Design an enzyme around this catalytic site. Structure first.
Site, mmCIF file in Angstrom:
data_model
loop_
_atom_site.group_PDB
_atom_site.id
_atom_site.type_symbol
_atom_site.label_atom_id
_atom_site.label_comp_id
_atom_site.label_asym_id
_atom_site.label_seq_id
_atom_site.Cartn_x
_atom_site.Cartn_y
_atom_site.Cartn_z
ATOM 1 N N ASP B 42 -42.322 35.349 117.925
ATOM 2 C CA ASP B 42 -42.615 34.020 118.479
ATOM 3 C C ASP B 42 -42.566 34.013 120.010
ATOM 4 O O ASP B 42 -41.527 34.293 120.603
ATOM 5 C CB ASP B 42 -41.710 32.947 117.865
ATOM 6 C CG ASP B 42 -42.287 31.550 117.945
ATOM 7 O OD1 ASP B 42 -42.791 31.176 119.023
ATOM 8 O OD2 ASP B 42 -42.200 30.813 116.940
ATOM 9 N N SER B 92 -46.320 26.225 118.424
ATOM 10 C CA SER B 92 -45.931 27.042 117.281
ATOM 11 C C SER B 92 -46.461 26.527 115.951
ATOM 12 O O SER B 92 -46.732 27.340 115.068
ATOM 13 C CB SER B 92 -44.420 27.130 117.181
ATOM 14 O OG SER B 92 -43.901 27.662 118.381
ATOM 15 N N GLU B 216 -18.968 27.079 108.188
ATOM 16 C CA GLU B 216 -18.471 27.842 109.343
ATOM 17 C C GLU B 216 -17.795 26.978 110.406
ATOM 18 O O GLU B 216 -16.888 27.464 111.079
ATOM 19 C CB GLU B 216 -19.588 28.683 109.975
ATOM 20 C CG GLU B 216 -20.024 29.874 109.150
ATOM 21 C CD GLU B 216 -20.997 30.789 109.876
ATOM 22 O OE1 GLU B 216 -22.165 30.386 110.072
ATOM 23 O OE2 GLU B 216 -20.574 31.886 110.304
ATOM 24 N N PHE B 269 -27.561 30.914 107.562
ATOM 25 C CA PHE B 269 -26.500 31.467 108.363
ATOM 26 C C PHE B 269 -25.968 30.648 109.529
ATOM 27 O O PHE B 269 -24.999 31.068 110.159
ATOM 28 C CB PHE B 269 -26.801 32.932 108.736
ATOM 29 C CG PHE B 269 -27.208 33.766 107.541
ATOM 30 C CD1 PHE B 269 -26.255 34.212 106.624
ATOM 31 C CD2 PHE B 269 -28.548 34.076 107.309
ATOM 32 C CE1 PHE B 269 -26.637 34.951 105.495
ATOM 33 C CE2 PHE B 269 -28.927 34.824 106.189
ATOM 34 C CZ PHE B 269 -27.974 35.257 105.289
ATOM 35 N N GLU B 270 -26.557 29.465 109.791
ATOM 36 C CA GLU B 270 -26.114 28.582 110.871
ATOM 37 C C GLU B 270 -26.513 27.155 110.573
ATOM 38 O O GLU B 270 -27.453 26.946 109.812
ATOM 39 C CB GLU B 270 -26.747 28.995 112.214
ATOM 40 C CG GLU B 270 -26.125 30.195 112.906
ATOM 41 C CD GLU B 270 -24.631 30.200 113.187
ATOM 42 O OE1 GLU B 270 -24.085 29.175 113.656
ATOM 43 O OE2 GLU B 270 -24.020 31.273 113.005
ATOM 44 N N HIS B 320 -38.296 29.693 126.679
ATOM 45 C CA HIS B 320 -38.232 28.243 126.946
ATOM 46 C C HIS B 320 -37.062 27.883 127.866
ATOM 47 O O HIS B 320 -37.225 27.040 128.744
ATOM 48 C CB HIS B 320 -38.166 27.409 125.663
ATOM 49 C CG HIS B 320 -39.487 27.271 124.988
ATOM 50 N ND1 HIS B 320 -40.593 26.783 125.657
ATOM 51 C CD2 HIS B 320 -39.841 27.560 123.717
ATOM 52 C CE1 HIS B 320 -41.584 26.795 124.785
ATOM 53 N NE2 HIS B 320 -41.177 27.240 123.597
#
Ligand SMILES: *[C@@H]1O[C@H](CO)[C@@H](O[C@@H]2O[C@H](CO)[C@@H](O[C@@H]3O[C@H](CO[C@@H]4O[C@H](CO)[C@@H](O)[C@H](O)[C@H]4NC(C)=O)[C@@H](O)[C@H](O)[C@H]3NC(C)=O)[C@H](O)[C@H]2NC(C)=O)[C@H](O)[C@H]1NC(C)=O
Ligand SMILES: *[C@@H]1O[C@H](CO[C@@H]2O[C@H](CO)[C@@H](O)[C@H](O)[C@H]2NC(C)=O)[C@@H](O[C@@H]2O[C@H](CO)[C@@H](O)[C@H](O)[C@H]2NC(C)=O)[C@H](O)[C@H]1NC(C)=O
Ligand SMILES: *[C@@H]1O[C@H](CO)[C@@H](O)[C@H](O)[C@H]1NC(C)=O
Ligand SMILES: *[C@@H]1O[C@H](CO)[C@@H](O)[C@H](O)[C@H]1NC(C)=O
Ligand SMILES: O=[N+]([O-])c1ccc(OP(=O)(O)O)cc1
Ligand SMILES: O=[N+]([O-])c1ccc(OP(=O)(O)O)cc1
Ligand SMILES: [Mg+2]
Ligand SMILES: [Mg+2]
Ligand SMILES: [Mg+2]
Ligand SMILES: [Mg+2]
Ligand SMILES: [Mg+2]
Ligand SMILES: [Mg+2]
Ligand SMILES: [Zn+2]
Ligand SMILES: [Zn+2]
Ligand SMILES: [Zn+2]
Ligand SMILES: [Zn+2]
Lengths: 486, 484
Positions: B42, B92, B216, B269-270, B320
């Site tokens: 990306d 995108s 988490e 995972f996040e 960015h």
């Protein structure tokens, strides 16, 4: 602008289906090449290619990015790694040795291995490397050099010269120690190292004795001959063979092109660099496409074949001046010269490569609308509430700092011929970029131009395709009636 | 640094001779592909590729530019024209529709034709376009989505979703009119539009009811579930088939990978994006290469083959933020994920493409010496007598006016992890570039990736190679034992 036809998925599915049909039917040409042509867009990196596509497309009445360039029709593509042996962000001289001689070299040196050292005349001897053009000549082919800069500039010099300092255009540019140690100025190497059939571009002043009035600017002492040795290098070149001709304007060039007594031609159209195409005197100055046509017509006469080098050398200079209008308009003309050579040559016997020596720190962004001018403004103001152009340079002369006040440029100002886009860092000249460049290829052995290659590979592909040294044992059949089905 | 071996022309002549031997022996694979793999960097334009090559090379103890990337070994190259139908400098979402669906589209919309209009929910209906991944699934192949951003981001969303607004991650992001008109948030489309065997990346928060503590970060309200409809989208996805498994950390992922009872896997995972690789907790967070390995191992089990999409999505985000260290380190990890998939798949039956959705306004210049850090300074001071970095951005948060006092940055400052390179124009976020990007290809039908192509061509090559709709009548022989 939303073109209605593009709203339908059938438009895109049909276009892709047609591209798949072209790809499935694409055939490599497995013979040797009679003719070898290298088109070099000086400083024409991938950002320049796209911006040129948009500009040329819009000049032709289209929206821009959808419209193919003459170069976009080339069947085979690759990426070229441009680094010089000593510098990862390269110059024109070091790169010239790679794509013209097939050996990577040091920054600011021409036709010498990296064993040589910049500005050290003694390091030349034993370290010279020979161009594909030199090797084409040895094999009996006709050879040609076409450029928009002086013919003594780094890129065209790579086809014939061996120098540790690219600034040595004439003997007037050389230190006495280098002259005494046996080093020769580029202008002298032009006429003496090898036989060149066609020489077209600028660089008159470096060929004539000090004070010789320029045929176009006789009253300007700054345009006069500069040579300190009193040699007339044009006269010496004419005297080498029967059938040589010297021209300094467009009318003389056109007449020479049709003259059957002319077999070798030297055309020097300016004291130094040729005028930018947008500033060109159409009655006095030939275009790059006109020079390429004359070069192909003359070189074509030799049934052994020819090697031709064509350079859009002012694309680089437009970018150095931070003036994208000049850089892109030069690239438009470069693409038209590619088209002209395509009309005059056949892929059956001609290997044509298109590439750049290196890129720039030029880019275009700002989420601009489809169909808008490449020189236009981003649709939204920047964080400081002021406008911003799509085109921006990382560095160079476009850097503005009216104290802590960034200008708030208009569409009228941004589209101006002499407008310098904003830059982050001030420099008297914008710098090259170190990123990879594209290689486009068509013709016998063009299919060997694939993947990610070292820049020096360009010279080897061309030498192999032409069965030139060190590939005289090429094992290739002569050209016949094998085409791409493209 | 002038390396001694490179002073000899024999070095360069031998290297070119070897490259000619590789090119002359290169053979296209004329069969269909059992497996289809698309690696998307990306924002990874040509400047990013070279700068990543230098960085990866130097990290490995080399000078840099001479050292090949895993992607540099791909035999077939092409240029991709990235423009969106409505915007010549693309986003995108619009690009995702082109390389994933095979139809060019409008800026900020996903899986819809350009007949649709951004943020106009009613324009969705009848204008949906279907991904190669959707079509791979219909043909019986196993399908996988691997990314370093939230799995609901524009690029991964392009494989399954149809939306007129890429910002609609959960129902909490949607206006009431769009919810009432029948539009669905991306997170819901993820679990309901099609069967996805492997989903790996971030984006936990958009899958859970409002206030659901993150496994988490339970104490942080900003990491909690965000859903207004009280649906547990992870639970609903698990219930779809027997053999599904949900993981939220690296240890659970490794255990799932070896478990024979696991046939479908969702790993988030996040709460949102996965940490930048340089900030990754190696015991808790899997790398992009590790996620790629687990996806290939699971998807490989289907005898019919698989379609896999792998995205180095944080390369874009680093650029960015005008922070080249982050952008380039993400690209280094992206290149390692390409290498891992290459070790696990065979080119005789696997078509692997590498490309970017678009470029940035990132560049590197200044005539730097061979072997110097990409984050370093140009060897000479600028016109104002102050230093300048090789890397510069056209625009973005790196802009420093300072009442007309340009900083005089040191090597120590410029090489810092959080350093923002200088820019010409101030923006909260640096913009995409409109220039062409590279396409690299290996495997059956990879030779069709040539010349200068429209971006939507990537989706058609992959569909054709896999004998997927609209090319079920491909006329290709099944994969055999012929290599490049
Ligand atoms: C693009 O290239 C053009 C082709 O060379 C170039 O044109 C030349 O430009 C100048 C004008 O700037 C001409 O010289 C000036 O123009 C007049 C010349 O005409 C003359 O008429 C007189 C009648 O008895 C006679 O005395 C004279 O000798 C004759 N000349 C010719 C060539 O037949 C003159 O009136 C004028 O005073 C003279 N002097 C000045 C400014 O002091 C020249 O003739 C042009 N050459 C041609 C072939 O047209 C052109 O400028 C260049 N640039 C552009 C922007 O077009
Ligand atoms: C990086 O993370 C290590 C593993 O984190 C532990 O495992 C999961 C994985 O996400 C996470 O949910 C927990 O927050 C964390 N907690 C516990 C209780 O294990 C951290 O290392 C440690 O892990 C070991 C077992 O491997 C355990 O004995 C420790 O107690 C745990 N650390 C604690 C409780 O402080 C490690 O802290 C972390 N490193 C950094 C720099 O953050
Ligand atoms: C700059 O001028 C434009 C007019 O095109 C205006 O819209 C904008 O407000 C101006 N920005 C300033 C003065 O900060
Ligand atoms: C910036 O610091 C450098 C030290 O590397 C020094 O050479 C230069 O003169 C300084 N520039 C200015 C204008 O302070
Ligand atoms: O193109 N060049 O090699 C070149 C010419 C002039 C420069 O300044 C920088 C680079
Ligand atoms: O679509 N995009 O990747 C995108 C567009 C504008 C941004 O800011 C950030 C990301
Ligand atoms: Mg040049
Ligand atoms: Mg002239
Ligand atoms: Mg032709
Ligand atoms: Mg994305
Ligand atoms: Mg984690
Ligand atoms: Mg393999
Ligand atoms: Zn150059
Ligand atoms: Zn230059
Ligand atoms: Zn993107
Ligand atoms: Zn982006």
């Amino acid at each position: 602008v939303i073109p209605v036809e593009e709203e339908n998925p059938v438009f895109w599915n049909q276009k892709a289906k047609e591209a798949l049909d072209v790809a499935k039917k694409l055939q490599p040409i497995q013979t040797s090449a009679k003719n070898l042509i290298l088109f070099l867009g000086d400083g024409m990196g991938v950002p320049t290619v796209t911006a040129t596509r948009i500009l040329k497309g819009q000049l032709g009445g289209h929206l821009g990015p959808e419209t193919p360039l003459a170069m976009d029709h080339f069947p085979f593509t690759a990426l070229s790694k441009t680094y010089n042996v000593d510098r990862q962000v390269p110059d024109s001289a070091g790169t010239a040795t790679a794509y013209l001689c097939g050996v990577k070299a040091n920054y600011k040196t021409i036709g010498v291995s990296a064993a040589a050292r910049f500005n050290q005349c003694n390091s030349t001897f034993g370290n010279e490397v020979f161009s594909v053009m030199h090797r084409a000549k040895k094999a009996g082919k006709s050879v040609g050099v076409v450029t928009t800069t002086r013919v003594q500039h780094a890129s065209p010099a790579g086809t014939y010269a061996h120098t540790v300092n690219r600034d040595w255009y004439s003997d007037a540019d050389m230190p006495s120690s280098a002259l005494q140690e046996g080093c020769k100025d580029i202008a002298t190497q032009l006429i003496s190292n090898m036989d060149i059939d066609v020489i077209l571009g600028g660089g008159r002043k470096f060929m004539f004795p000090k004070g010789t009035p320029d045929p176009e600017y006789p009253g300007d002492s700054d345009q006069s001959g500069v040579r300190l040795d009193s040699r007339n290098l044009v006269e010496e070149w004419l005297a080498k063979y029967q059938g040589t001709r010297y021209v300094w304007n467009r009318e003389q060039l056109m007449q020479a092109s049709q003259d059957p007594a002319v077999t070798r031609l030297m055309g020097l159209f300016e004291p130094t660099e040729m005028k930018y195409d947008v500033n060109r005197n159409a009655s006095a100055d030939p275009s790059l496409a006109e020079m390429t046509e004359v070069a192909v017509r003359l070189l074509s006469r030799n049934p052994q074949g020819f090697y031709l080098f064509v350079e859009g050398g002012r694309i680089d200079q437009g970018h150095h001046a931070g003036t994208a209008y000049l850089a892109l308009t030069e690239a438009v003309m470069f693409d038209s010269a590619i088209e002209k050579a395509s009309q005059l040559t056949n892929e059956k016997d001609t290997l044509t490569l298109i590439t750049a020596d290196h890129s720039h720190v030029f880019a275009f962004g700002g989420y601009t609308l489809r169909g808008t001018s490449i020189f236009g403004l981003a649709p939204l103001n920047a964080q400081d509430g002021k406008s911003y152009t799509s085109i921006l340079y990382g560095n160079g002369p476009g850097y503005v700092l009216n104290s802590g006040n960034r200008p708030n440029v208009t569409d009228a100002e941004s589209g101006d011929v002499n407008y310098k886009q904003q830059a982050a860092v001030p420099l008297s000249s914008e710098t090259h970029g170190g990123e990879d460049v594209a290689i486009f290829a068509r013709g016998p052995q063009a299919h060997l131009v694939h993947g990610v290659q070292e820049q020096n590979y360009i010279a080897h592909v061309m030498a192999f395709a032409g069965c030139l040294e060190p590939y005289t044992d090429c094992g290739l059949a002569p050209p016949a009636d094998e085409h791409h089905h493209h």
